[PDB]
Curated annotation (Swiss-Prot), chain A:
It comes from Homo sapiens (Human). The gene is ERCC2. This is General transcription and DNA repair factor IIH helicase subunit XPD. Interacts with GTF2H2/p44 via the C-terminus of this protein; mutations in the C-terminal region of XPD do not alter its helicase activity, but prevent its interaction with and helicase stimulation by GTF2H2/p44. One of its GO terms (biological process) is determination of adult lifespan. ATP-dependent 5'-3' DNA helicase. Component of the general transcription and DNA repair factor IIH (TFIIH) core complex, not absolutely essential for minimal transcription in vitro. Required for transcription-coupled nucleotide excision repair (NER) of damaged DNA; recognizes damaged bases. Sequestered in chromatin on UV-damaged DNA. When complexed to CDK-activating kinase (CAK), involved in transcription by RNA polymerase II. In NER, TFIIH acts by opening DNA around the lesion to allow the excision of the damaged oligonucleotide and its replacement by a new DNA fragment. ISGylated. SMART domains: DEXDc2 (SM00488), HELICc2 (SM00491).
From Swiss-Prot, chain B:
It comes from Homo sapiens. The gene is MNAT1. GO terms for molecular function: cyclin-dependent protein serine/threonine kinase activator activity; zinc ion binding. GO terms for cellular component: CAK-ERCC2 complex; cyclin-dependent protein kinase holoenzyme complex; nucleoplasm; transcription factor TFIIH core complex; transcription factor TFIIH holo complex; transcription factor TFIIK complex. Associates primarily with CDK7 and cyclin H to form the CAK complex. CAK can further associate with the core-TFIIH to form the TFIIH basal transcription factor. Highest levels in colon and testis. Moderate levels are present thymus, prostate, ovary, and small intestine. The lowest levels are found in spleen and leukocytes. Stabilizes the cyclin H-CDK7 complex to form a functional CDK-activating kinase (CAK) enzymatic complex. CAK activates the cyclin-associated kinases CDK1, CDK2, CDK4 and CDK6 by threonine phosphorylation. CAK complexed to the core-TFIIH basal transcription factor activates RNA polymerase II by serine phosphorylation of the repetitive C-terminal domain (CTD) of its large subunit (POLR2A), allowing its escape from the promoter and elongation of the transcripts. Involved in cell cycle control and in RNA transcription by RNA polymerase II. This is CDK-activating kinase assembly factor MAT1. The modification N-acetylmethionine is found at M1. A zinc finger (RING-type) spans 6-50. GO terms for biological process: adult heart development; DNA repair; G1/S transition of mitotic cell cycle; negative regulation of apoptotic process; nucleotide-excision repair; positive regulation of smooth muscle cell proliferation; regulation of G1/S transition of mitotic cell cycle; regulation of transcription by RNA polymerase II.
Length: 714, 171
């Protein structure tokens, strides 16, 4: 299937493409031709990946100099595996068409914990542990000692990789993570480091955001080599939250105590090093005078001189002083306090800690800790986190804020206070990506309206188009139910949350919808506490028992183990005729991680508009700062955060292969024009005024009829 | 307040944390209920060490770590010296070399004998006070004044923003 696109001719593996695919390809080609960053939305969970990859490959063939390589990022490794599968299929199709191999390379990066071949680190699954063990095995000290070949466990894979892969790079091919593990085992090399080196000469590289956003690890692999590369973020509508998380650092009392203990161990190790080997490790002082990774981005990062901290004892005392200041500032009991610049000024005044020497604290920590030949960085990780916070605060506070919480939420009195350093704008941390890369395409599904995104992230978009899925059959028939059998408002307001009548309306709607809907249904609440209250009310009444009789019921919990077990049983229930009703939370990690396909989550129920609690002070900074700068109304941003989350958690049923399914929102709030307007275009256009505010019974009847229509073949 | 207790009367440190450390030439975790016990007999003598004190050598401080207490007080005293701004020296190394010597002096004073430090500090007193020390006292006073002025300007702007949006709504 060769498509005569306006720009050029583009190959395509599958037989047919919908008109929305034509629109997507033409708009994407327009953006690439303009060579300017832009954002676009496409409904389908699958199909967008293949269309995007095919268009990018064709554009690379036409103008190889224009685009050096493609950097395609996905939320999670299980998801990016499907992307690499799609890319492998596309490459096989193109190779068959051409009749011969071409110099094209495509690979996926992942954590050493996810992929590795060392038996010692294999049993351990905790990421910091894998990082520390690998650092110990690959340490420059361990490398030098391996040169001596003394009796000590040395990781042969990295040494063999240094010997061979340095000389010879991999010719070409596509390697999934699992297949790359096998390749590393066969060749006695690192599946991780081999891909890391291939990044230098790779046409396509795929990895999650935390490999491309956080300055600590993103920069090293996203160096200026890709000066003009097509960087693409997929389903990255929750990009602001992750970009903020890449900067926010949380300091707790337990973490601070662990830091103090680690610092004591550091002092003891320094004394032992002084008595054992002093001159050779002191040469570090000379190289320092000449002049865990830094959190400072490219331009913000500075390397002039370490500062007043030039020796191990001096640096240790500096960390002692800063840790004492943080300890006392956290121990203070008072209302939540915000102080972005005042915190730095008060630190400098109270404990005599100048911001310039504080700036290089984390970098000097890395160097000095390397000198100590520590067993691993896992033990001292809390100290490195505190150092990253210490350097960040002295680095900048213009678009940041230090929040102190002597008392935690959900606890009238708790002896574990927490100090947050949550950011307020993601533009600060995502600026390097936009500036360095010629164009970035934020391709997303279920995207809340694009107009806000340029305001939140400071960039000038080239194209702003919303693509609506078009099929010969109406795959999706969304509806909103606001009126119950009692013709009573069913809004899940904070003041209306306690309403037993509203809870009863929700329970009856779920009962009837489970009675009619086929096997497999997922209901998303607004919070764990609200979900528990509704479940308890239904349990006190007889509605819950009737729901249990009609279909099996499963519930989500904060604990990941129970969540995984419940979802595993839910899948089997969906396969069998019992069916299942999975209650979950919109913010729950399960909602974002899981993907619902044919005969999975057939009818997506949304109980109440997803709104975060109006007491969490972090969101207060994040929101009022957005009001002050970029001029976004607080209510506007709050409703945007609700609609984007709802679209995220309700857009799964249309994953791909044209699998029918209905999305019912049991809240009259969605019927409001603002919510409908902010809803994604593809869902909204299907939505109509006739079914906008159906009663519970009317919604059930129309759902039954729509399921009848979708049951029959094409 | 996290300290287990005074070397002698570790009681108050358990009942209430209101007591704050008292700095002395000895460098000690002294506590007010124990300061009264020192005043009653000796009147300015460390109980165990017996170090003489002119006038009780007592000043309030707030950190559970006695080493941090001594280090912070010594740094407070030292900052009065070597306060010249960085830009006064064009040499790249000299920017932080003198700070290295300053912190070395602080660590020296914390534990080792301070006689050499005092003699050196006399030498720096004579040579630098002639011109530079008083000049940088003036400049640091100017920057303290202007930082307090700038914070009051920030808070005037925030009060005006609050009250003007309130008057927008009511109008
Ligand atoms: S050097 Fe390679 S094989 Fe050895 S632990 Fe690290 S990633 Fe695994
Ligand atoms: Zn006492
Ligand atoms: Zn004493």
């Amino acid at each position: 299937m060769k498509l005569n696109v306006d720009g050029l001719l583009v190959y395509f593996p599958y037989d047919y493409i919908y008109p929305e695919q034509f629109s997507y390809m033409r708009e994407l080609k327009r953006t690439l031709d303009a060579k300017g960053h832009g954002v676009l939305e496409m409904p389908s969970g699958t199909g967008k990946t293949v269309s995007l990859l095919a268009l990018i490959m064709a554009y690379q063939r036409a103008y190889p100099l224009e685009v050096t390589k493609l950097i395609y990022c996905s939320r999670t490794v299980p998801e990016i595996e499907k992307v690499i599968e799609e890319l492998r299929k596309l490459l096989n199709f193109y190779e068959k068409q051409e009749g011969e191999k071409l110099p094209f390379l495509g690979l996926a990066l992942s954590s050493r914990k996810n992929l590795c071949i060392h038996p010692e680190v294999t049993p351990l699954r905790f990421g910091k542990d894998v990082d520390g063990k690998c650092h110990s095995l690959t340490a420059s000290y361990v490398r030098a000692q391996y040169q001596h070949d003394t009796s000590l466990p040395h990781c042969r894979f990295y040494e063999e990789f240094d010997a061979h892969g340095r000389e010879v790079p991999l010719p070409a091919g596509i390697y999934n993570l699992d297949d790359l593990k096998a390749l590393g085992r066969r060749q006695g090399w690192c599946p991780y480091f081999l891909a890391r080196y291939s990044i230098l000469h790779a046409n396509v590289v795929v990895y999650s955001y935390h490999y491309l956003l956080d300055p600590k690890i993103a920069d090293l692999v996203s160096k200026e080599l890709a000066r003009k590369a097509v960087v693409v973020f997929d389903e990255a509508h929750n990009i602001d939250n992750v970009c903020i998380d890449s900067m926010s650092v949380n300091l707790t009392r337990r973490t601070l105590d662990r830091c103090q203990g680690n610092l004591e161990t550091l002092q003891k190790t320094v004394l032992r090093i002084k008595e054992t080997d002093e001159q050779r490790l002191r040469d570090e002082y000379r190289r320092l005078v000449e002049g865990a990774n830094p959190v400072l981005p490219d331009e913000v990062l500075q390397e002039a001189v370490p500062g007043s901290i030039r020796t191990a004892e001096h640096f240790l005392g500096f960390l002692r002083r800063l840790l004492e200041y943080v300890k006392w500032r956290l121990r203070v009991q008072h209302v939540v306090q915000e102080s972005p610049p005042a915190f730095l000024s008060g630190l400098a005044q109270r404990v005599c800690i100048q911001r310039k020497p504080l700036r290089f604290c984390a970098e000097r920590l890395r160097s000095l800790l390397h000198t100590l030949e520590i067993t691993d960085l896992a033990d001292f990780s809390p100290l490195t986190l505190l150092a990253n916070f210490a350097t960040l605060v002295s680095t900048y506070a213009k678009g940041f804020t230090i929040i102190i919480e002597p008392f935690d939420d959900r606890t009238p009195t708790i002896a574990n206070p927490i100090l947050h350093f949550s950011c307020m704008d993601a533009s600060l941390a995502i600026k390097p990506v936009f500036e360095r890369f010629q164009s970035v395409i934020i391709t997303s599904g279920t995207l809340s309206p694009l107009d806000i995104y340029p305001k939140i992230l400071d960039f000038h978009p080239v194209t702003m188009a919303t693509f609506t899925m078009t099929l010969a059959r109406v795959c999706l028939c969304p509806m909103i139910i606001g009126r119950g059998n009692d013709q009573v408002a069913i809004s899940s307001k904070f003041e209306t949350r306690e309403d037993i009548a509203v809870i009863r309306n929700y329970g009856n709607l779920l009962l009837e919808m489970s009675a009619v809907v086929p096997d497999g249904i997922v209901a998303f609440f607004t919070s764990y506490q609200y979900m528990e209250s509704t479940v308890a009310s239904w349990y006190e009444q007889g509605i819950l028992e009737n729901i249990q009789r009609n279909k099996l019921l499963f519930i989500e919990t904060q604990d990941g183990a129970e969540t995984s077990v419940a979802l595993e049983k839910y899948q089997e229930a969906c396969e069998n005729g019992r069916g299942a009703i999975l209650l979950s939370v919109a913010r729950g990690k399960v909602s974002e991680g899981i993907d619902f396909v044919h005969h999975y989550g057939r009818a997506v129920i949304m109980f109440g508009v997803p709104y975060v609690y109006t007491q969490s002070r972090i969101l207060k900074a994040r929101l009022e700062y957005l009001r002050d700068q970029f001029q976004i109304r607080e209510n506007d941003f709050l409703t945007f955060d609700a609609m984007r989350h709802a679209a995220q958690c309700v857009g799964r049923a249309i994953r791909g292969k044209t699998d029918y399914g209905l999305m019912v929102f049991a809240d009259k709030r969605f019927a409001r024009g603002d919510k409908r307007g902010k809803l994604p275009r593809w869902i909204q256009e299907h939505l109509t005024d006739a079914n906008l505010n159906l009663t519970v019974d009317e919604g059930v009847q129309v759902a039954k009829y729509f399921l009848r229509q979708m049951a029959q073949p094409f | 307040m996290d300290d287990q207790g005074c070397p002698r009367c570790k009681t108050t440190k358990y009942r209430n944390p209101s007591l704050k450390l008292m700095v002395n030439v000895c460098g000690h975790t002294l506590c007010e209920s124990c300061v009264d016990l020192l005043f009653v007999r000796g009147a300015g003598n460390c109980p165990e060490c017996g170090t003489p004190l002119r006038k009780s050598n007592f000043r309030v401080q707030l950190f559970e770590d006695p080493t941090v207490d001594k280090e912070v007080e010594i740094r407070k005293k030292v900052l009065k010296i070597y306060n010249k701004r960085e830009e006064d020296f064009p040499s790249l190394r000299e920017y932080n070399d003198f700070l290295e010597e300053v912190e070395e002096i602080v660590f020296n004073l914390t534990n080792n004998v301070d006689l050499d430090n005092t003699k050196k500090k006399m030498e720096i007193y004579q040579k630098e006070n002639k011109d530079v020390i008083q000049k940088n006292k003036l400049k640091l006073t100017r920057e303290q004044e202007e930082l307090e002025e700038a914070l009051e300007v920030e808070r005037q702007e925030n009060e005006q923003r609050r009250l003007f949006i309130q008057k927008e709504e009511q109008l």
